[PDB]
A paper describes a structure:
To evaluate metal-ion affinity and to identify protein metal-binding sites for Sr2+ and Cs+, a class C β-lactamase (BLA) derived from the moderate halophile Chromohalobacter sp. 560 (HaBLA; molecular weight 39 536) was chosen as a model system. HaBLA, although a moderately halophilic periplasmic protein, has a particularly abundant content of acidic amino acids similar to those in extremely halophilic proteins. The crystal structure of a halophilic β-lactamase from Chromohalobacter sp. 560 (HaBLA) was determined to resolutions of between 1.8 and 2.9 Å in space group P31 using X-ray crystallography. Seven binding sites (site 1 to site 7) for divalent metal ions (Ca2+ and/or Sr2+) and one binding site (site 8) for Cs+ per HaBLA molecule were identified by X-ray diffraction studies including anomalous dispersion.
The NQ-HaBLA crystals soaked into solutions containing Na+, Cs+ and Ca2+ [conditions 1A (0 mM Na+/100 mM Cs+), 1B (75 mM Na+/25 mM Cs+) and 1C (90 mM Na+/10 mM Cs+)] diffracted to resolutions of 2.0, 1.8 and 2.1 Å, respectively. Structural analysis of NQ-HaBLA in condition 1A (0 mM Na+/100 mM Cs+) showed ten locations for bound Ca2+ (Ca1–Ca10) and two locations for Cs+ (Cs1 and Cs2) in an asymmetric unit. The peak heights of the anomalous difference Fourier maps were 17.5σ for Cs1 and 8.0σ for Cs2. The binding sites of Ca2+ were integrated into five sites in one molecule of NQ-HaBLA, which were the same locations as the site 2, site 3, site 5, site 6 and site 7 Ca2+-binding sites in NQ-HaBLA without soaking. Moreover, the binding sites of Cs+ ions were integrated into one site (site 8) per molecule of NQ-HaBLA. The Cs+ ion bound at site 8 was predominantly recognized by two main-chain O atoms and the aromatic ring of Trp189. The aromatic ring of Trp189 interacts with Cs+ by a cation–π interaction. The site 8 Cs+-binding site is not located at the interface of HaBLA molecules but is constructed on the surface of a single HaBLA molecule, indicating that monodisperse HaBLA itself can recognize Cs+.
Numbering used by the authors: 8 to 364
Amino acid sequence: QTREVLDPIVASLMEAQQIPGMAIALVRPEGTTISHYGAADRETGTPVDDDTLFEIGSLSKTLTATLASLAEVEGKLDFDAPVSRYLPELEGSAFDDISGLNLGTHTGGGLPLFVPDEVTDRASLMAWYREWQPTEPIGESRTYSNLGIGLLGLETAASLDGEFVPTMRAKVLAPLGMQDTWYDVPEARMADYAMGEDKDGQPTRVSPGVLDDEAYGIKTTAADLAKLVRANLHLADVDAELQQAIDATRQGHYRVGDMTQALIWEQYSLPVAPETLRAGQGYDMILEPNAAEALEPPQSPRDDVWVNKTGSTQGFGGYIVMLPGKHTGLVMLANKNYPNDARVEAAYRILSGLGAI
Ligand SMILES: [Ca+2]
Ligand SMILES: [Ca+2]
Ligand SMILES: [Ca+2]
Ligand SMILES: [Ca+2]
Ligand SMILES: [Cl-]
Ligand SMILES: [Cs+]
């Protein structure tokens, strides 16, 4: 079926990249297909199955964006307001001039990629934010940032008068039916927690860290992520406000060369060449500041685009692609951090082989 297209491509991918195990979800009108391949843990050979939890790394940022968007829909968060309006401990800092929208689009004045070493907790984090000097013009330059999306998370939590994780669960994960999605894997599920494999073939698992929940900390199944994708594709039963919040995460906010930056989601007009997709996932886009032009004709979610997001940890590699015009989506989770180029190629070949591009 679909499996005759999908299975050979994932077998070849897993052999070429030496991926121990994968979980794949294909979302289409007429339904969602879940497929599991290989081993959750190379050392034990425990197979990947419906219960296997994968670290999704930066794919976690899509949930942070979705909660932020819901707070906005509920009228509790103004996306263009200074972040210091919701975190008054940052009054008088650069965050008087930086907005939640900036943070969701990585246009927060060059806010850096990583949490610095000297930041070890919430207090030292907030002290660091207060002292930090922008290095790029706010709203005119994109630097991919864990500090930024992390702060959007803090801002959102404050705007909703709740703690980030329980609030995320109550307002987003639960209404989406994402009951196998964890920030902290309980002891009772550790036997289902896949073991990562790093680039040297060594076992590895993500460590806790500041802003982990907000920026990279989710462990989940392909099926749970498929619920989020289904909602993005208008294929789920979700209340009006959450649907509105989800749709708003796909609004185009900045043109960044060939890429359009939405709320964490990144997209490209169709037809898109794989090279363009590759250039979105490399050094030039991820590790350098890129000029960003605000779309203030604020772009309505489009139906003629390739929408995507990568996510990695040291031992895991994930990729989501959505084609709203075809009402189809793809979630690929692996317990190996394998090259973004190969994620793009596999996704493209799958979607092309299914006739969706
Ligand atoms: Ca406003
Ligand atoms: Ca099990
Ligand atoms: Ca945490
Ligand atoms: Ca090739
Ligand atoms: Cl970090
Ligand atoms: Cs849960």
